[PDB]
Write a protein that binds this ligand. Structure first.
Ligand code: CLR
Ligand code: CLR
Ligand code: CLR
Ligand code: CLR
Ligand code: A1H3I
Ligand code: OLC
Ligand code: OLC
Ligand code: OLC
Ligand code: OLC
Ligand code: OLC
Ligand code: OLC
Ligand code: OLA
Ligand code: OLA
Ligand code: OLA
Ligand code: OLA
Ligand code: OLA
Ligand code: OLA
Ligand code: OLA
Ligand code: OLA
Ligand code: OLA
Ligand code: OLA
Ligand code: OLA
Ligand code: OLA
Ligand code: OLA
Ligand code: OLA
Ligand code: NA
Length: 383
């Protein structure tokens, strides 16, 4: 069959993906610019991620359509159009890792987050990561390429001029670079790091949620211990356990009343006044109902919002892996199994197309999972 037919389907699908990648991610950038509730450090990496996907539609996809034709070109110019998508994918990996690390700092040290993670430091990390993405993605342009050994038979059959090659990805970009350097070192290792960070985020959140329910249980159990105590020394022991727990959960008016009321009951318990200490300890229930339960449920609601936001960011990282892994796995078969027939052209186009679809998916995940984004999208679209 004429090459231009299956080429037309591939190119048409690519152009459709490019249109969707630009539109959805311009909408993400417009939402962050317009809404100050979306202007935080986490979303500055989201915007950098969206900028990379905009460039996938504007440059990488036109480059991919070009490289698929095998047109005659100077080898190093062919190398650039083949490698620029590697820059954008690397930038995405840095942004995804930074988002995960940012959410871990928020869940692990919320007391120092605003002092450690600032907009100025975020903007500098983003600039550094873009420079490193160019260095990693364009490493073949520094000499690790196949331009020294061109397929002159393919170039002559295409009528290419002197110094030109049939511009094809696997003819200019070495497979050992794509497998060992790009996939294993620069893609697989950071994704595995992302997985570990997310595991530590969800483990820390589960630990802090368990600690809240434990402190709540310890407060109410020691309440009953005081109620059914038989001597003043037992009430003293239980109150000492409540006071240490009250200060640990405090690390404002409700806790000042709570600790003060415990100190009251502990003073009577030291004097041997058991029924006076028990009666004073009963006043803690009034403080617990009016103040302590409100703090526990607000902290619980805040921790669950962080789990929800971390799940949304993990889905984004997972979809990046799902969309990009098939192409990388095919490269592994090409490189590691020279006795295996090369994957057919239609599967390569499908794997290339699938990797490009990742540039479309993030704006949907924000709209479906983040209310502030969804509402800002609606306002932008409606107006
Ligand atoms: C500001 C942005 C949009 C600039 C985009 C510039 C792009 C489109 C330019 C910059 C470098 C260019 C390449 C440089 C060299 C060659 C080798 C030549 O034999 C064929 C064209 C080719 C392969 C060019 C294609 C177009 C190219 C990739
Ligand atoms: C917006 C500004 C900063 C653009 C900076 C990037 C420019 C300078 C880069 C991007 C791609 C580059 C080209 C990539 C490949 C080739 C083909 C090679 O045989 C000669 C150099 C040449 C032609 C490069 C010249 C410099 C180049 C055009
Ligand atoms: C992340 C998950 C969803 C990836 C799915 C795995 C994909 C990429 C795997 C599963 C089966 C694999 C194929 C199995 C057999 C062959 C025949 C061989 O001659 C070339 C490679 C080829 C054609 C493989 C290409 C990669 C492949 C299509
Ligand atoms: C944690 C997971 C997702 C890491 C990614 C798995 C990758 C590295 C694995 C999954 C399946 C593997 C392939 C399975 C089968 C073969 C055929 C053999 O003749 C050479 C190795 C080769 C081509 C393997 C290379 C490595 C491979 C592509
Ligand atoms: C992730 C980087 N990357 C790649 O790794 C890649 C690739 N395009 C191919 C392969 C194309 C091909 C292979 C055999 C053929 O006969 C043919 O006509 C075309 N690969 C292996 N691009 C798309 C431009 C790409 O972005
Ligand atoms: C071809 C051009 C090369 C692309 C390099 C610059 C791309 C992006 C940074 C813009 C997003 C920064 C916003 C973070 C806040
Ligand atoms: C808007 C779009 C440009 C439409 C795509 C034009 C790109 C030229 C494709 C082409 O020339 O044919 C493909 C290849 O040669 C066949 O094997
Ligand atoms: C905003 C910027 C938008 C402008 C970008 C230009 C649009 C497209 C790709 C360039 C068109 C491809 C060049 C045509 C190649 C040609 O003329 O044919 C060569 C022939 O096959 C043998 O020499
Ligand atoms: C923001 C602005 C949007 C950026 C525009 C990107 C459009 C196209 C990339 C096309 C790459 C150049 C196409 C190759 C045409 C060509 O040079 O082929 C002629 C002949 O083969 C040479 O010897
Ligand atoms: C900072 C690194 C910039 C390094 C300068 C990039 C020049 C790469 C180059 O042109 O080298 C051609 C050839 O591929 C080499 O073996
Ligand atoms: C985790 C990635 C580890 C996967 C590394 C597996 C490499 C595959 C391999 O070594 O295959 C070579 C084969 O022996 C050639 O004949
Ligand atoms: C191909 C991989 C290339 C590796 C190059 C290694 C260089 C990485 C450099 C570290 C970035 C640190 C930037 C600090 C600049 C000053 C910022 C400041 O004022 O503290
Ligand atoms: C819908 C987008 C269609 C764009 C036209 C692509 C025609 C296919 C081709 O150029 O070979
Ligand atoms: C290539 C296309 C990239 C453009 C995408 C950027 C989208 C919006 C950037 C944020 C808004 C820019 C300034 C808005 C001016 C204003 O206040 O009205
Ligand atoms: C290159 C592609 C577009 C880059 C757009 C940068 C986003 C502009 C808005 C910045 C912000 O949301 O604060
Ligand atoms: C914002 C603009 C986005 C890109 C606009 C251009 C759209 C066209 C997309 C790819 C053009 C590929 C050109 C074909 C290469 C030459 C084929 C050949 O000479 O054999
Ligand atoms: C060829 C690239 C080799 C490796 C380059 C190393 C990366 C250094 C890039 C420039 C850093 C410029 C930004 C530093 C200022 C902001 C730092 C910050 O606020 O944390
Ligand atoms: C080596 C690097 C070659 C040139 C690449 C330039 C890197 C992109 C520059 C900085 C991006 C700024 C992000 C916005 C803050
Ligand atoms: C960013 C890292 C380096 C990019 C260097 C681009 C290579 C220059 C063109 C190669 C050539 O002239 O043959
Ligand atoms: C981290 C996950 C990937 C780690 C590296 C796996 C490297 C396996 C060694 C390749 C052996 C292939 C060979 O020697 O032919
Ligand atoms: C093979 C690496 C998998 C990459 C996905 C890890 C990032 C998010 C994980 C799930 C939570
Ligand atoms: C699901 C999308 C369709 C791709 C399905 C699986 C591809 C793997 C099966 C191998 C395809 C044929 C390869 C061959 O003939 O050697
Ligand atoms: C989402 C998953 C991808 C979206 C839809 C993918 C549909 C087909 C991609 C085009 C693949 C080209 C197949 C024909 C090319 C050929 O005959 O060699
Ligand atoms: C094919 C064109 C792109 C398809 C995108 C499918 C996934 C998008 C979000 C739902
Ligand atoms: C290819 C992947 C396509 C999209 C799957 C996830 C999109 C669903 C939006 C919620
Ligand atoms: Na991306």
């Amino acid at each position: 069959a004429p090459p231009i037919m299956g080429s037309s389907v591939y190119i048409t699908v690519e152009l459709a993906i490019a249109v969707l990648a630009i539109l959805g991610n311009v909408l993400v950038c417009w939402a962050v610019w317009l809404n100050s509730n979306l202007q935080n450090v986490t979303n500055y990496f989201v915007v950098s991620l969206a900028a990379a996907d905009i460039l996938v539609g504007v440059l990488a996809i036109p480059f991919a359509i070009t490289i698929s034709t095998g047109f005659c070109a100077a080898c190093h110019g062919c190398l650039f159009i083949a490698c620029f998508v590697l820059v954008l994918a690397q930038s995405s990996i840095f942004s995804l890792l930074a988002i995960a690390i940012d959410r871990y700092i928020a869940i692990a040290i919320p007391l120092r987050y605003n002092g450690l993670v600032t907009g100025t430091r975020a903007a500098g990390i983003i600039a550094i990561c873009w420079v490193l993405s160019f260095a990693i993605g364009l490493t073949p342009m520094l000499g690790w390429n196949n331009c020294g050994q061109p397929k002159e038979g393919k170039a002559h059959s295409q009528g290419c001029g002197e110094g030109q090659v049939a511009c094809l990805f696997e003819d200019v970009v070495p497979m050992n670079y794509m497998v060992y350097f790009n996939f294993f070192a620069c893609v697989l290792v950071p994704l595995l790091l992302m997985l570990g960070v997310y595991l530590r985020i969800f483990a820390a959140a589960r630990r802090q949620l368990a600690d809240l329910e434990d402190n709540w249980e310890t407060l109410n159990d020691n309440l009953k211990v005081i109620e059914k105590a038989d001597n003043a020394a037992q009430v003293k022991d239980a109150l000492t356990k409540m006071r240490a727990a009250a200060l640990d959960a405090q690390k404002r008016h409700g806790f000042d009343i709570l600790v003060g009321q415990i100190d009251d009951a502990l003073k009577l318990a030291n004097e041997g006044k058991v029924k006076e200490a028990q009666a004073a300890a009963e006043q803690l229930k009034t403080t617990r109902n009016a103040y302590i339960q409100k703090y526990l449920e607000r902290a619980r609601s805040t921790l669950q919002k962080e789990v929800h936001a971390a799940k949304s960011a993990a889905i984004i990282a997972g979809l990046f892996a799902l969309c990009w892994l098939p192409l990388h796995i095919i490269n592994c078969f090409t490189f590691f199994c020279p006795d295996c027939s090369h994957a057919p052209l239609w599967l390569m186009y499908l794997a290339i197309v699938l990797s490009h679809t990742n540039s479309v998916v993030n704006p949907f995940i924000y709209a479906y999972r983040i209310r502030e984004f969804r509402q800002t999208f609606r306002k932008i679209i409606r107006s």
